[PDB]
Amino acid sequence: SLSGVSHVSLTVRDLDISCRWYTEILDWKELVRGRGDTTSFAHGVLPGGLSIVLREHDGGGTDLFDETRPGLDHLSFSVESMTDLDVLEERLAKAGAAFTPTQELPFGWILAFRDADNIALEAMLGR
Amino acid sequence: SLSGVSHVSLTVRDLDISCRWYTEILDWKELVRGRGDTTSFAHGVLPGGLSIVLREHDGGGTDLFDETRPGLDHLSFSVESMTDLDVLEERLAKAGAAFTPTQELPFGWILAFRDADNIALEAMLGREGHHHHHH
Known part of the structure; x- marks a missing residue:
């Protein structure tokens, strides 16, 4: 059956800035970086083993996270x-x-x- | 040390519709639903143990899920x-x-x-x- 979370992918405004933030605050460990068609990403893991992918989407506005928007x-x-x-x-x-x-x-x-x-x-x- | 995900809280347009969707598709089981300051919520668990909280914001439902926006x-x-x-x-x-x-x-x-x-x-x-x- 379904066991748990394989990984969580979070959209960030600036990949580099977010990579440093997650590394410093949560000990996130970047494993690999990459480029998609319209995005740049960084796959990392937290202590304990949880996988967190940070993804920056092309031409994103300055827009911040908003709890009222469907999603997280x-x-x-x-x-x-x-x-x-x-x-x-x-x-x-x-x-x-x-x-x-x-x-x-x-x-x-x-x-x-x-x-x-x-x-x-x-x-x-x-x- | 950090030990994983305690739970994931998702913002949904219609709480009842989502509860039924998650129940039917992922065997999500509702444990309790309540009222927050500006939201309605339903906390449930999936097989395997993952806790998922569905949350409807009184002032939400105008924007759509958009992966290009910060968040999930x-x-x-x-x-x-x-x-x-x-x-x-x-x-x-x-x-x-x-x-x-x-x-x-x-x-x-x-x-x-x-x-x-x-x-x-x-x-x-x-x-x-x-x-x-x-x-």
Whole structure:
């Protein structure tokens, strides 16, 4: 049957800028780079093994991510301990990224942040 | 350390339509639906454990899924056997959904399809180290 996620492909405004951001913030490791007919991409993997492909589409506007547009509302990553969240907050702050400090909720702790294109991301330590 | 995807929250034009679509196509099972500040949501889980939250924004439904816009380009699921792909194609066809026949590639087989909001999805089966091409 269906097991899980093979990989998530995210559209970014500037490949290079996003590659650096994901590398610095989430330890994303670029494996290969490439060029499509109307796009440029970078396939990378996060600690834990999750595959994340960043894709820049030709002649894209300046337009940022918008939760109200069909597609991604937000992507939530699972972490192993509170330390992971502390480290993320430290990296986010140092990069001057937008983020709301870890909040404790009924089902766990959530750290909500935004990438270089305002894409809504979260890191959660579940109970 | 980061350990993968906790869950994926998708923005959809019509919550009810999407719930039925995901239930019927991917055996998504709704665990609870509620109301947020400016949204309606339904949290469900897929076979294999992946959590998917469907979310309808009160002020949404005017723009279309557009992979050229920041956010999701496409979401690819891992499947265990060819039969999983065969079943998906059958369901997609029966439902009159948008999809292309499963394609055989060097490193595996991929079934590309769209949900009710045209969001780009894929089902993937690996080749190397398996015997799916030996039957």
